[PDB]
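Lecture 7, part B: from sequences to assemblies.

Below are the input chains for today's worked example.
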Amino acid sequence: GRRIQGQRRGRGTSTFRAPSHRYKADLEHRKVEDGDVIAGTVVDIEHDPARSAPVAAVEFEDGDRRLILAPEGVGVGDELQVGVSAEIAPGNTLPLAEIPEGVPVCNVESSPGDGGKFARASGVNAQLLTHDRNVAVVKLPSGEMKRLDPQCRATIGVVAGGGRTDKPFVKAGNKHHKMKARGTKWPNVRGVAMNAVDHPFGGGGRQHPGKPKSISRNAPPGRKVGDIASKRTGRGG
RNA sequence: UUCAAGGGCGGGGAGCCAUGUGGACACGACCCGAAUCCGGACGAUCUACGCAUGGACAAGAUGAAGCGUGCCGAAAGGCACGUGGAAGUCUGUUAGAGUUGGUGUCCUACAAUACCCUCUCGUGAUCUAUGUGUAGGGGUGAAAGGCCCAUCGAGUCCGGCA
RNA sequence: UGAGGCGCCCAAAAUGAUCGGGACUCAAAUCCACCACCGAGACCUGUCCGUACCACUCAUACUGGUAAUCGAGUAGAUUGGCGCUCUAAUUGGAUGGAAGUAGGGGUGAAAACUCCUAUGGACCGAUUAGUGACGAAAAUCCUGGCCAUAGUAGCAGCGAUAGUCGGGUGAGAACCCCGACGGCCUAAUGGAUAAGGGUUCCUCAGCACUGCUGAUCAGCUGAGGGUUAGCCGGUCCUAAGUCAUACCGCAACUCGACUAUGACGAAAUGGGAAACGGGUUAAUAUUCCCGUGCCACUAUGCAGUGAAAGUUGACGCCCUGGGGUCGAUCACGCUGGGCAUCGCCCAGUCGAACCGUCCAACUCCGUGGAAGCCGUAAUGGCAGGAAGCGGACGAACGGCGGCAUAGGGAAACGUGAUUCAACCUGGGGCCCAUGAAAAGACGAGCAUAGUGUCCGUACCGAGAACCGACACAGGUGUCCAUGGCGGCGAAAGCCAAGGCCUGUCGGGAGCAACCAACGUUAGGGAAUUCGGCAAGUUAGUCCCGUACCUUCGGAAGAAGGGAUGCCUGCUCCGGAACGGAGCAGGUCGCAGUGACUCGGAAGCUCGGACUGUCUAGUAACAACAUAGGUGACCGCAAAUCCGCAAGGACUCGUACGGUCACUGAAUCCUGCCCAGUGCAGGUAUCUGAACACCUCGUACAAGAGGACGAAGGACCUGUCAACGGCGGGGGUCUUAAGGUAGCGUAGUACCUUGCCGCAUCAGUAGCGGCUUGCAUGAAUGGAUUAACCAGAGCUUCACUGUCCCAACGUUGGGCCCGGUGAACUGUACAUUCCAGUGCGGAGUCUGGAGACACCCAGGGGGAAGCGAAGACCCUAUGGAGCUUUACUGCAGGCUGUCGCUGAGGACUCUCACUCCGGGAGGAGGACACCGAUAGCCGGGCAGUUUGACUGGGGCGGUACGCGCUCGAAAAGAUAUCGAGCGCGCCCUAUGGCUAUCUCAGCCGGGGACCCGGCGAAGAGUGCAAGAGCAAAAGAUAGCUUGACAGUGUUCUUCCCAACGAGGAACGCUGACGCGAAAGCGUGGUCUAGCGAACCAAUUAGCCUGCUUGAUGCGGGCAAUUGAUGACAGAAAAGCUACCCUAGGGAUAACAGAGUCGUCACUCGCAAGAGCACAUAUCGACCGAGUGGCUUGCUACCUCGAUGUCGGUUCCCUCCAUCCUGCCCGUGCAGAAGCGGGCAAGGGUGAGGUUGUUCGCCUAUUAAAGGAGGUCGUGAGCUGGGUUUAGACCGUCGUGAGACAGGUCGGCUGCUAUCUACUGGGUGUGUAGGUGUCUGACAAGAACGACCGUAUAGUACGAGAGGAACUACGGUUGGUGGCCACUGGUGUACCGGUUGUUCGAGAGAGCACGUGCCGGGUAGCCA
Ligand SMILES: CSC[S@](=O)C[C@H](CO)NC(=O)/C=C/c1c(C)[nH]c(=O)[nH]c1=O
Ligand SMILES: [Cl-]
Ligand SMILES: [Cl-]
Ligand SMILES: [Cl-]
Ligand SMILES: [Cl-]
Ligand SMILES: [K+]
Ligand SMILES: [Mg+2]
Ligand SMILES: [Mg+2]
Ligand SMILES: [Mg+2]
Ligand SMILES: [Mg+2]
Ligand SMILES: [Mg+2]
Ligand SMILES: [Mg+2]
Ligand SMILES: [Mg+2]
Ligand SMILES: [Mg+2]
Ligand SMILES: [Mg+2]
Ligand SMILES: [Mg+2]
Ligand SMILES: [Mg+2]
Ligand SMILES: [Mg+2]
Ligand SMILES: [Mg+2]
Ligand SMILES: [Mg+2]
Ligand SMILES: [Mg+2]
Ligand SMILES: [Mg+2]
Ligand SMILES: [Mg+2]
Ligand SMILES: [Mg+2]
Ligand SMILES: [Mg+2]
Ligand SMILES: [Mg+2]
Ligand SMILES: [Mg+2]
Ligand SMILES: [Mg+2]
Ligand SMILES: [Mg+2]
Ligand SMILES: [Mg+2]
Ligand SMILES: [Mg+2]
Ligand SMILES: [Mg+2]
Ligand SMILES: [Mg+2]
Ligand SMILES: [Mg+2]
Ligand SMILES: [Mg+2]
Ligand SMILES: [Mg+2]
Ligand SMILES: [Mg+2]
Ligand SMILES: [Mg+2]
Ligand SMILES: [Mg+2]
Ligand SMILES: [Mg+2]
Ligand SMILES: [Mg+2]
Ligand SMILES: [Mg+2]
Ligand SMILES: [Mg+2]
Ligand SMILES: [Mg+2]
Ligand SMILES: [Mg+2]
Ligand SMILES: [Mg+2]
Ligand SMILES: [Mg+2]
Ligand SMILES: [Mg+2]
Ligand SMILES: [Mg+2]
Ligand SMILES: [Mg+2]
Ligand SMILES: [Mg+2]
Ligand SMILES: [Mg+2]
Ligand SMILES: [Mg+2]
Ligand SMILES: [Mg+2]
Ligand SMILES: [Mg+2]
Ligand SMILES: [Mg+2]
Ligand SMILES: [Mg+2]
Ligand SMILES: [Mg+2]
Ligand SMILES: [Mg+2]
Ligand code: NA
Ligand code: NA
Ligand code: NA
Ligand code: NA
Ligand code: NA
Ligand code: NA
Ligand code: NA
Ligand code: NA
Ligand code: NA
Ligand code: NA
Ligand code: NA
Ligand code: NA
Ligand code: NA
Ligand code: NA
Ligand code: NA
Ligand code: NA
Ligand code: NA
Ligand code: NA
Ligand code: NA
Ligand code: NA
Ligand code: NA
Ligand code: NA
Ligand code: NA
Ligand code: NA
Ligand code: NA
Ligand code: NA
Ligand SMILES: [Sr+2]
Ligand SMILES: [Sr+2]
Ligand SMILES: [Sr+2]
Ligand SMILES: [Sr+2]
Ligand SMILES: [Sr+2]
Ligand SMILES: [Sr+2]
Ligand SMILES: [Sr+2]
Ligand SMILES: [Sr+2]
Ligand SMILES: [Sr+2]
Ligand SMILES: [Sr+2]
Ligand SMILES: [Sr+2]
Ligand SMILES: [Sr+2]
Ligand SMILES: [Sr+2]
Ligand SMILES: [Sr+2]
Ligand SMILES: [Sr+2]
Ligand SMILES: [Sr+2]
Ligand SMILES: [Sr+2]
Ligand SMILES: [Sr+2]
Ligand SMILES: [Sr+2]
Ligand SMILES: [Sr+2]
Ligand SMILES: [Sr+2]
Ligand SMILES: [Sr+2]
Ligand SMILES: [Sr+2]
Ligand SMILES: [Sr+2]
Ligand SMILES: [Sr+2]
Ligand SMILES: [Sr+2]
Ligand SMILES: [Sr+2]
Ligand SMILES: [Sr+2]
Ligand SMILES: [Sr+2]
Ligand SMILES: [Sr+2]
Ligand SMILES: [Sr+2]
Ligand SMILES: [Sr+2]
Ligand SMILES: [Sr+2]
Ligand SMILES: [Sr+2]
Ligand SMILES: [Sr+2]
Ligand SMILES: [Sr+2]
Ligand SMILES: [Sr+2]
Ligand SMILES: [Sr+2]
Ligand SMILES: [Sr+2]
Ligand SMILES: [Sr+2]
Ligand SMILES: [Sr+2]
Ligand SMILES: [Sr+2]
Ligand SMILES: [Sr+2]
Ligand SMILES: [Sr+2]
Ligand SMILES: [Sr+2]
Ligand SMILES: [Sr+2]
Ligand SMILES: [Sr+2]
Ligand SMILES: [Sr+2]
Ligand SMILES: [Sr+2]
Ligand SMILES: [Sr+2]
Ligand SMILES: [Sr+2]
Ligand SMILES: [Sr+2]
Ligand SMILES: [Sr+2]
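Predicted structure of the full complex, as structure tokens:
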């Protein structure tokens, strides 16, 4: 047949790329020499096109003006700290080691100095549970217990924008505007609604997948559609 | 070949070459005739979708939240009037976009998709110009096997090829 | 009373009857005899030719001879000859005229040869041997040329109907120019431009070309000329993004991703230093010239030490205040014009950049001191300091002054105001959406001077300059969005400025038919139709008023009702408007939203929630999307995806994420099933590859086996909002469960027009209910639902030419004339008609009939008309797209192993390598990544296959390999999807021999046993059938292994007649068994029980392997076993309605033709009953027929096409008669029924469901008959059904997909040549004229039917009931004609009146061929 939509994606053509030339900044933690002698002042709160959440512009002591992944409760004028000796206050960044157990953090680094990888979406937060000399245990938004190098930096507090998901889009037009700010092809035509040549589920008088939807992990691209390697399906049992 | 026998093939000198001609096989194989398949190229001046930078939307209707005033209330609030001006909101041949019916006109046409009346949309998932990107078993597709320069259930050109 | 001959009745069909026709009756019939004739290419006969044979001969050269026993021919075989080109040898012709061509003479059976004459003006032969791009009637053959078509179609149709009278120029004027009059265009038909074009621009001179006619004209032809820039674009900047170089990949590159660098990337329309006004030319113009001004850089001078922080460039959508120019309008003045019953109407009244100055808003400061005040259109503001007062900063493309005794104007050369586009500046609101960047500029003075180069510059910008082959009704961006009236308006309509008469052929006919657009139609009012399709109705604004239902938004403009102008004088709101809302009085019309503009309304049901999307070019929908619901994967060194790789999208993203899927708003809900399939997890044991390891084997190696065992599978578990499933049976069974809530005859229900009800005169429709559901049912989502809809169906009110039933009118065509001027199509002939025949669907054949030639107009019956090598169907060892547990492979994923890879069946470490980090360093780590290989998964991808037979194909079946009987016609051979029926083995005895013996069955004596008798065979002999067999071929007993090895002959397979395996009969040789021996035994009495090559295993001996020997392991001769049943041998599944090609009437669908079982109709016989009575009437059985209306059968015609059903319109016919006329019978009193006969003149109608045909139903009727004409009628109409592509449901299928099952949508080309006919002409014939006739023939339905009255309340009859003859009056259908009457029309005409323009008035134009309304003459009509 013809390559399915999931295969057109990988080519990274315009239709599938994110509007990067419109994105603001890479909200990675600042790189400090050591000591924590780095402080800045929240100079402004801005909208972040790539995450539908707010971001804060900070002016650091040494003269660096950088956008920051802002937690909830940060406002203009407030002073933020980034370093091993930073104060344990919402909005400050420091290694997990320096963080008191039982404190919600966000923008947690995967590997020390990478800039942050976990808990960066609207209103989410990781939960630092255990400390140690070799391993800091964090509970991520998905609820999974993650073991991290205690040298991994994080920001105290939860991410700004919480509850963004509580309000329904109501209209296709609203979904539309948001989708235009992402790297996604939208709207979505059902596989069952296409011709056999276009999808494993296409074809047949009435619409229906002429096959079970749970597909093997080993399936090749073009065939791996439907419920990928499902451990189970439905709501029952 | 055969204990044995019986079979098979060959045996008392005619061939070799040349020229014409009958016929066979591979090759285009008496000549034309068709839908393919493959290779390398050329096309996004059409069109599909995305992106960049610009542009367009008379007038009218309806009257959301919010706010106000008055009365009622212990309060919560309620009611009335006003204000306000929301909306993939209504009417609209505004610009602009489209095309339900006439199965009208035309059907060697004005036109290889046109004409007229009726009809639908017209502040938005809107329409539109230019630039720009995606290329052939590949694009693009709110999916009709639609569209990729009058051609697409696999473009076009030349070649494979007689 | 029997028999025979001829005839009669039985006896009905569709355009015109037939024996070929005429026509025939003591025959021109039939039968019995006879007589004489005609009539082939036969037969006889003369001459000649060919061929064969004979004699003579070198001869196949002559000559002679023979043919009763020779003379036709498609495919094909054989052989002699004609012509063409060039070569060679030999030999000729030609300027005293070659070849060729044209006409003509001669020869040859013919191919073809030759001569004469004319033309021509230079080459041309013959013989012989060669050479070959050597011969055309044909291929929808190719190219060129040409005729008919035809002086034909077009030069009309579009909301842009456009001209006319004079004159000018010229050889020539409808369309070239001037004037007048008349018109057209207003977001365009005007002005400026982008792309694109490229000289189209201007001038002069032209008209052969181009131009829908003409042309003096031009976008055409000839010749010249024309585009002038510091300040308008380019140039500069960067955008999405592109390229180049470096680096890396790649076999490689002109290929490819990242990362660096550099460059490229915006001409209307992104950012951006600076120019305005006027004048000038045939054509340029912010470019030239005049005046005035400005910017940048540089130099000099003065000033200045500031200089980079900040600001700007620089920004979304929606609402809105304020400032404010142009425009427009109002008031008054000035200048000029127009009009002249008034006193009005029009135009103008100007003046830039720039320099200078003014500042509202915003922000902030001082003062002040609000505890309730300040403020807005609105929000709002304040002791964190309100108002008020003062102040800093601070705007216009704006005001003001200069510019300006610049410019411009004939002149005047204004002044104020309102509403205010541009432009300036604020306030508010929205985002799961956040609305560029960079160069540059400001920051940062002034004088004077110098420099400011390079490229573009014309013109069109479109119903003739662009793209569409065109001077194409198409397509094509920007701005002019503020000209006047109008009105809500950037709407309509009318009119300016400006443009045009080129959406470019004209002339003529009261101008016919017919067609395209359109106006008006009495009464009825959807009767029309599949369907109100088409048309119409309603309409603007204000007031009153407004249901069910509802998600409380809506429904809603629901519905329904009323008002509407003008004039006079006023009130209210507001600062006011040339803004708005009202009042009082007066008054006109048919009509006051007067034209124009401008909704018809209501209810029920189905679907999809909604806005949105889509098949460019037959589908706009119920399909796609959607928010909402849900499930799946993934912690980021991730999941998913692209790349061979280098690398990459997602991703400046991180679970409130984003990937993969399903369902499809809300609301109420979403049951049972984990057996199969899918996914996932687990797994003692089982199974499970390669490397390494072990055993055997090999001096080694091949190889055989073993141990170990990953993923995977077995096995267990989880999982259905995972594929899917939820039946039959009984009061469980398959295969897990056995259908719960709901809904239900459904867009799903075959039966089916289900049944009841509603509604209608009548309702296959629709709605409600019932419901056992052929075959509903829960995210394959169920139910339900307000709102929405060019979605499907139904009903009602209103309205109407849809209809009854048509008419009249308008505009453009049509017709005639001038000019211009195609195409389609053409084997030939062609004046046809009725029958027949023929490959069964004829203008051309046969027989008749008719027919004087030509032309004009017409509507289209026929030419199975033209257009397209049928899209249907089948066939082909065709193609393609699609599917899958088809065949075979390939990517990809998982997994083991080896290399990378290091040190000390579980472990530590660091040093390769990986990742994080700017770095130090951290994390990990011999793993991972990568290379190689092995096992598993693997329609994600590729190549293929998927057979044949067949009363078409499919399904079914196998007549696909074998044996028997019959078919089979007495040798042999012989078909069908012919009839009956078998074989794919079985048997160590059920084989072989020998000995002894005789069987079924019946009878007699003591179903077992014993004895006797009869008994040619009916028994038995493995299994079909047919055949064979009795001291046996059977039975019993005993013995035995011949069911043996080798090798042939022959026949069969395969008649004749070639073909393999297989088989049989008969031999020779060897070895045996039994018998006294002859002899028997090559399996079972005979005919079925079967399998190639390649390969393997096996048996015995031998041959052989690359210089040589040995060993291993191979190659071969002969043969046995292993299978191909599609059985003389491929390894092999489907869909296509998205389809494509080659062909086929070799094969189907409709139709024709044949048949006539079926169907319709009739007849013979007459049982039976009809109270008695066969026959008033009904009528079984059985028998005999006719038709060609039903159906089936066949495959004869057609696949280079003969368009389906139904309807409609229009014409002809048949009779088997429904009515009407005339009769006969009756179980006929009458009236009326019932049955029958003659008879085809006429009639046979309107409606409800349904596409229907049919049929059911309703009211009428004399009756409301049936059938043929290609199931008459699409070059006539329709397009509802059927029958393409889109989509849904039920059922089927793993799936693609399928289903005379249902459902919504879905294209109808052509200018008539011939013929035919309706009408109209011109000629010829009869044979200069006028007028009047005849009547062969021809057409008619010209008339059909009914009601009523008198007869008569009579005849008849107890009564009830109730006729006729005849004479009358009227109605209806049909027919022909006419307009006094009634009615319609009446774009003659007269009137009323709305908007607008001409100043008013008067009088007029436009508002589509009347703006609208009223009346209406002639004429035409019903
Ligand atoms: C020129 S061919 C005309 S068609 O054959 C006309 C005939 C009329 O009987 N129609 C049919 O035969 C229709 C057959 C159909 C069949 C077999 N199957 C279907 O599903 N639908 C049909 O219409
Ligand atoms: Cl989202
Ligand atoms: Cl000859
Ligand atoms: Cl320019
Ligand atoms: Cl304001
Ligand atoms: K055919
Ligand atoms: Mg970041
Ligand atoms: Mg996008
Ligand atoms: Mg979807
Ligand atoms: Mg589809
Ligand atoms: Mg597929
Ligand atoms: Mg383009
Ligand atoms: Mg209001
Ligand atoms: Mg574009
Ligand atoms: Mg010679
Ligand atoms: Mg020739
Ligand atoms: Mg003609
Ligand atoms: Mg001239
Ligand atoms: Mg000019
Ligand atoms: Mg024109
Ligand atoms: Mg009427
Ligand atoms: Mg009818
Ligand atoms: Mg209509
Ligand atoms: Mg007032
Ligand atoms: Mg229905
Ligand atoms: Mg919809
Ligand atoms: Mg279409
Ligand atoms: Mg539509
Ligand atoms: Mg969803
Ligand atoms: Mg769906
Ligand atoms: Mg849907
Ligand atoms: Mg019903
Ligand atoms: Mg369920
Ligand atoms: Mg579904
Ligand atoms: Mg064909
Ligand atoms: Mg087909
Ligand atoms: Mg194929
Ligand atoms: Mg890295
Ligand atoms: Mg395939
Ligand atoms: Mg092949
Ligand atoms: Mg076949
Ligand atoms: Mg015989
Ligand atoms: Mg084989
Ligand atoms: Mg063997
Ligand atoms: Mg065979
Ligand atoms: Mg074909
Ligand atoms: Mg034939
Ligand atoms: Mg046939
Ligand atoms: Mg035809
Ligand atoms: Mg009769
Ligand atoms: Mg009687
Ligand atoms: Mg008649
Ligand atoms: Mg017919
Ligand atoms: Mg016809
Ligand atoms: Mg037709
Ligand atoms: Mg026609
Ligand atoms: Mg229909
Ligand atoms: Mg489809
Ligand atoms: Mg069908
Ligand atoms: Na092929
Ligand atoms: Na393009
Ligand atoms: Na309100
Ligand atoms: Na339309
Ligand atoms: Na292709
Ligand atoms: Na012959
Ligand atoms: Na031709
Ligand atoms: Na000024
Ligand atoms: Na003209
Ligand atoms: Na809309
Ligand atoms: Na299961
Ligand atoms: Na079901
Ligand atoms: Na809609
Ligand atoms: Na009419
Ligand atoms: Na005709
Ligand atoms: Na195909
Ligand atoms: Na086959
Ligand atoms: Na059959
Ligand atoms: Na044999
Ligand atoms: Na018959
Ligand atoms: Na009659
Ligand atoms: Na009917
Ligand atoms: Na026909
Ligand atoms: Na018809
Ligand atoms: Na038609
Ligand atoms: Na028809
Ligand atoms: Sr990052
Ligand atoms: Sr980083
Ligand atoms: Sr499917
Ligand atoms: Sr469940
Ligand atoms: Sr483009
Ligand atoms: Sr709207
Ligand atoms: Sr239509
Ligand atoms: Sr119409
Ligand atoms: Sr057309
Ligand atoms: Sr509208
Ligand atoms: Sr195309
Ligand atoms: Sr070729
Ligand atoms: Sr002969
Ligand atoms: Sr002969
Ligand atoms: Sr030739
Ligand atoms: Sr001609
Ligand atoms: Sr005209
Ligand atoms: Sr036209
Ligand atoms: Sr001339
Ligand atoms: Sr010109
Ligand atoms: Sr550039
Ligand atoms: Sr610009
Ligand atoms: Sr204003
Ligand atoms: Sr110009
Ligand atoms: Sr222009
Ligand atoms: Sr145009
Ligand atoms: Sr004018
Ligand atoms: Sr002209
Ligand atoms: Sr009239
Ligand atoms: Sr009707
Ligand atoms: Sr009707
Ligand atoms: Sr359409
Ligand atoms: Sr729902
Ligand atoms: Sr399972
Ligand atoms: Sr039930
Ligand atoms: Sr005609
Ligand atoms: Sr058949
Ligand atoms: Sr025998
Ligand atoms: Sr199947
Ligand atoms: Sr289909
Ligand atoms: Sr034909
Ligand atoms: Sr008769
Ligand atoms: Sr009668
Ligand atoms: Sr019929
Ligand atoms: Sr019926
Ligand atoms: Sr039907
Ligand atoms: Sr169907
Ligand atoms: Sr239809
Ligand atoms: Sr004569
Ligand atoms: Sr009477
Ligand atoms: Sr009486
Ligand atoms: Sr008029
Ligand atoms: Sr009106």
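Note for the exam: DSSP finds two helices and twelve strands in chain A. Keep this in mind when comparing with the next example.
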